[PDB]
Design an enzyme around this catalytic site. Structure first.
Site, short mmCIF file in Angstrom:
data_model
loop_
_atom_site.label_atom_id
_atom_site.label_comp_id
_atom_site.label_asym_id
_atom_site.label_seq_id
_atom_site.Cartn_x
_atom_site.Cartn_y
_atom_site.Cartn_z
N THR A 72 -6.66 11.04 22.25
CA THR A 72 -7.88 11.57 22.84
C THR A 72 -7.65 13.01 23.29
OG1 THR A 72 -7.54 11.03 25.18
CG2 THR A 72 -8.31 9.25 23.74
N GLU A 259 3.23 18.31 33.24
CA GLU A 259 4.02 17.25 32.60
C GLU A 259 5.17 17.85 31.76
OE1 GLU A 259 0.30 14.08 32.31
OE2 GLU A 259 1.36 14.63 30.47
N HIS A 277 3.53 9.42 31.14
CA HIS A 277 2.38 9.49 30.26
C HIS A 277 2.46 8.48 29.12
CE1 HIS A 277 -0.98 12.43 28.86
NE2 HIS A 277 -1.24 11.19 28.48
N1 LIG Z 1 -2.75 8.09 30.05
C1 LIG Z 1 -2.96 8.06 28.60
O1 LIG Z 1 -2.01 8.06 27.83
C2 LIG Z 1 -4.41 8.02 28.07
C3 LIG Z 1 -5.48 8.86 28.82
N2 LIG Z 1 -6.84 8.92 28.32
C4 LIG Z 1 -7.79 9.68 29.09
O2 LIG Z 1 -8.60 8.61 30.01
C5 LIG Z 1 -9.73 9.15 30.30
C6 LIG Z 1 -10.92 8.16 29.83
O3 LIG Z 1 -10.85 8.04 28.38
P1 LIG Z 1 -12.05 7.34 27.66
O4 LIG Z 1 -12.51 6.23 28.43
O5 LIG Z 1 -11.73 6.97 26.21
O6 LIG Z 1 -13.19 8.53 27.63
P2 LIG Z 1 -14.84 8.24 27.54
O7 LIG Z 1 -15.37 9.57 27.05
O8 LIG Z 1 -15.10 7.12 26.59
O9 LIG Z 1 -15.37 7.90 29.06
C7 LIG Z 1 -15.15 8.86 30.00
C8 LIG Z 1 -16.31 8.70 31.05
O10 LIG Z 1 -16.07 9.49 32.11
C9 LIG Z 1 -17.57 9.85 32.59
N3 LIG Z 1 -17.59 10.88 33.60
C10 LIG Z 1 -17.69 12.19 33.38
N4 LIG Z 1 -17.71 12.79 34.60
C11 LIG Z 1 -17.66 11.84 35.52
C12 LIG Z 1 -17.65 11.89 36.90
N5 LIG Z 1 -17.71 12.98 37.87
N6 LIG Z 1 -17.57 10.77 37.63
C13 LIG Z 1 -17.50 9.57 37.00
N7 LIG Z 1 -17.50 9.51 35.64
C14 LIG Z 1 -17.57 10.66 34.91
C15 LIG Z 1 -18.17 10.22 31.48
O11 LIG Z 1 -19.66 10.13 31.60
C16 LIG Z 1 -17.66 9.12 30.45
O12 LIG Z 1 -18.53 8.09 30.36
C17 LIG Z 1 -9.76 10.51 29.52
O13 LIG Z 1 -9.34 11.48 30.39
C18 LIG Z 1 -8.72 10.29 28.41
O14 LIG Z 1 -8.23 11.64 27.87
C19 LIG Z 1 -7.23 8.21 27.13
C20 LIG Z 1 -6.21 7.32 26.34
C21 LIG Z 1 -4.69 7.33 26.73
#
Ligand SMILES: NC(=O)C1=CN([C@@H]2O[C@H](COP(=O)(O)OP(=O)(O)OC[C@H]3O[C@@H](n4cnc5c(N)ncnc54)[C@H](O)[C@@H]3O)[C@@H](O)[C@H]2O)C=CC1
Ligand SMILES: NC(=O)C1=CN([C@@H]2O[C@H](COP(=O)(O)OP(=O)(O)OC[C@H]3O[C@@H](n4cnc5c(N)ncnc54)[C@H](O)[C@@H]3O)[C@@H](O)[C@H]2O)C=CC1
Lengths: 299, 279
Positions: A72, A259, A277
Site C-alpha cells: 500500500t 524507520e 514494520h
Molecule cells: N504496518 C503495515 O505493514 C501495513 C500498513 N498499512 C497502512 O494502514 C493504513 C490503513 O490501510 P487500509 O485500510 O488498506 O486503507 P483504506 O484506504 O482502505 O482505509 C483507510 C481509511 O482511513 C479513513 N480516514 C481518512 N482520514 C481519517 C480520519 N481523520 N479519521 C478516521 N479515518 C480517516 C479513510 O476515509 C479510509 O476509509 C494505511 O496507512 C496503510 O498504508 C497497510 C498494510 C500493511
C-alpha cells in the site's frame, strides 16, 4: 518490455510477468549506481519499501515507463517526479490488508496480557506471576479510527472476543459501519469510552497526531493504543508523555515516523511492544502483492 | 465459621465471606498451595476446601473424601481468560511478536527474520473441546481458521454447534498448522503430544499449551523444535513450575508466560466472588 525487480518479492511476481511476455531481472539490494545502470534497459521497476525511487533515480532512467509497488502507499516513490515524466505509478492496495489486520489483533492481545514482556521475563530466568496480571478483552471497548480495508477486518475479529467496537471514519456512513458491527460516534465521544484504540488511516494532515496530548487527556486512564498503520498518526512525544504519566497503560507500534527509529524512548519503554514494520510481512501477503502488481504490469 | 485464604485472591473474596489452619472450618486456595494428604489430616476442623479456579489437581481429593471434607471449585470463572491467552499465543506464534519486541529493544531492525504466517485458511486442531476449547474455536474461526478437534466425551453434534469437526487423533495430526490443548492432565493426556505424535504432524506445525504442563512432552517438543518438525511453541505451563530446565524457554522459537492463563483482574474477581458465595 523489460522489467527490473529490485526488492524482496515472492517468486510468483517474476513468473506472472513472463507469462505476459516480459523479460525480467531480479537483483536485490542494489546501489544507486548499480540500480540506475540496471534500469537503463528496463521500462518497468518493481519494489517494496527497500528500493528508494527518488527524483534522481526517476530522471536517470530514461526508458522508465512504470513503477510498481508491492504494498500500500507510495512512500518510497516520488509521485511528483514520476508524473513530471509521464511515468505510471501502481501499487497493491488489497494484497496485504488481512496480514495487517491479523497483526493488529495480535498486538491487542499482547497488550491485554503482556505476552512479549512475560516471554522476556521468562528468558531472563524469572517467574513473575503477579507482575503480569492482565486484562480480559470480553466486554471491553475497542475504538477503531479508519474503517477501510483493514479497520473493518480488525473489527469483525475482535468482535468474536466480545469486544464492543466503536469508531470513526469521515467517508464511511454510520449505516455502513453498523453493517460490520462498528458503531460510529464523533471523535470527542470516542476517547472517554475506549479501553483500546487502534488506528487504520492513511498519513494525512488530518491524521498526523490524531492521538495527541489533548486526546490522550480525554481518554480513560489506562487506555492502550495500537498503531499498525503509519508512523506519526499517534504523536510519538504525546504517547511517551502518556506512558510516563500512566494515562496510557501500554502501546503497540509496528510503524514509526522514522524507520528504523533513531529515538529509542518509546521502543525502550517497558509498556511498549513493537515490530520492525511487519504488518505486511507474511509469506501469503507477499505472494498476493507480488501477483497483484505483476497483473497490473502485464496489461 | 472461620476461613483461611492461602493464595493470591481478589479482595472481594475476603469481603464477601463477611499450621494456621488449626482453628478454621474453611480453606481457600488457587494452585500455588498444595493441599496434600498430610496437610488435610492435620486440620481436624476442616469442613470445606474451596479452589478459586478450574483445576483441583493441587488438592488431595482422596484425603478430603476420607475425612468428609467437601472440595469445591469455580469451573467457569477463568475459562474466558484462558481462551483469550490461548488465542494471543496463536497470534504470537504466527507473527513472532514477542521475539520482534525483544529484537527492537536490542536496537535491531530485523525485517526479514520475522517474516510470518497469515492465519486465514490455516487449520487449528483443538484437543479438548470443553469450556475453553470451544471458546478458542469460535474466536479463531473469525480469523478464517479451519477448526478441527477431538474430545472423547463431546459428541460430534455438540462440537458441530460451535463449528468444530471432530476426527480420530490419527487423522488430526497431518492436517494441522497449529495445535492447542485444552484437556485435564491425565495418564491418557500425559504426552498427548510426544515423539510419536510429532512424527505424524505437518513439518512446521506450531503448538500451544495453555492447559497443564506435561500434556505436551517437553523432551519431545525440544526435539521437534531442533529438527524444524515444530516451527514454534507457546507455553503457559510446565511440568515443573517454575521450570528448572531452561532449554525450551531459552529456545528462540518458544514463547512463554509464567502460568498467566487465569491471571486477569476479571477472572480473579469472578473466581474469588464465586467461591466466597459458595461458602
Ligand atoms: N504496518 C503495515 O505493514 C501495513 C500498513 N498499512 C497502512 O494502514 C493504513 C490503513 O490501510 P487500509 O485500510 O488498506 O486503507 P483504506 O484506504 O482502505 O482505509 C483507510 C481509511 O482511513 C479513513 N480516514 C481518512 N482520514 C481519517 C480520519 N481523520 N479519521 C478516521 N479515518 C480517516 C479513510 O476515509 C479510509 O476509509 C494505511 O496507512 C496503510 O498504508 C497497510 C498494510 C500493511
Ligand atoms: N493456563 C491457565 O492458567 C489455565 C489452565 N486451565 C486448564 O485448561 C484445561 C481445560 O479446562 P476446561 O476447558 O475448563 O476443562 P473442561 O472440563 O471443560 O474440558 C476438558 C475436556 O478435555 C476432554 N478430554 C479429556 N481427555 C481428553 C483427551 N485424551 N483428548 C481430548 N480431550 C480430552 C475432556 O473430555 C473435557 O471435555 C484444564 O487442564 C484446566 O486446568 C484452565 C483455566 C486457566
Amino acid at each position: 518490455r523489460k522489467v527490473l525487480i529490485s526488492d524482496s518479492l515472492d517468486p510468483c511476481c517474476r513468473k506472472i510477468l513472463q507469462d505476459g511476455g516480459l523479460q525480467v531481472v531480479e537483483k536485490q539490494n542494489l546501489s544507486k549506481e548499480e540500480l540506475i545502470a540496471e534500469l537503463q534497459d528496463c521500462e518497468g521497476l518493481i519494489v517494496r519499501s527497500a528500493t528508494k525511487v527518488t527524483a534522481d533515480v526517476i530522471n536517470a532512467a530514461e526508458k522508465l515507463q512504470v513503477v510498481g509497488r508491492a504494498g500500500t502507499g507510495v512512500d518510497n516513490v516520488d509521485l511528483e517526479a514520476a508524473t513530471r515524466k509521464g511515468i505510471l505509478v501502481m501499487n497493491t492496495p488489497n494484497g496485504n490488508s488481512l496480514s495487517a489486520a491479523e497483526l493488529t489483533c495480535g498486538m491487542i492481545m499482547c497488550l491485554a496480557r503482556q505476552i512479549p514482556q512475560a516471554t522476556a521475563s521468562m528468558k531472563d530466568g524469572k517467574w513473575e506471576r503477579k507482575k503480569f496480571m492482565g486484562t480480559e478483552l470480553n466486554g471491553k471497548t475497542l475504538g477503531i479510527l479508519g474503517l477501510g480495508r483493514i479497520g473493518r477486518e480488525v473489527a469483525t475479529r475482535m468482535q468474536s472476543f466480545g469486544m464492543k467496537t466503536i469508531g470513526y471514519d469521515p467517508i464511511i456512513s454510520p449505516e455502513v459501519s453498523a453493517s460490520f458491527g462498528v458503531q460510529q460516534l464523533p471523535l470527542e465521544e470516542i476517547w472517554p469510552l475506549c479501553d483500546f484504540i487502534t488506528v487504520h488511516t492513511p498519513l494525512l494532515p488530518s491524521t498526523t497526531g490524531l492521538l495527541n496530548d489533548n486526546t490522550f487527556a480525554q481518554c480513560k486512564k489506562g487506555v492502550r493504543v495500537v498503531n499498525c498503520a503509519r508512523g506519526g498518526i499517534v504523536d510519538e512525544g504525546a504517547l511517551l508523555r502518556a506512558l510516563q504519566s500512566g494515562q496510557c497503560a501500554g502501546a503497540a507500534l509496528d510503524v514509526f515516523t522514522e524507520e528504523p527509529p533513531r529515538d529509542r524512548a518509546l521502543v525502550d519503554h517497558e509498556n511498549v511492544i513493537s515490530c520492525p514494520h511487519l504488518g505486511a510481512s507474511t509469506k501469503e501477503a507477499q505472494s498476493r502483492c507480488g501477483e497483484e502488481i505483476a497483473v497490473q504490469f502485464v496489461d
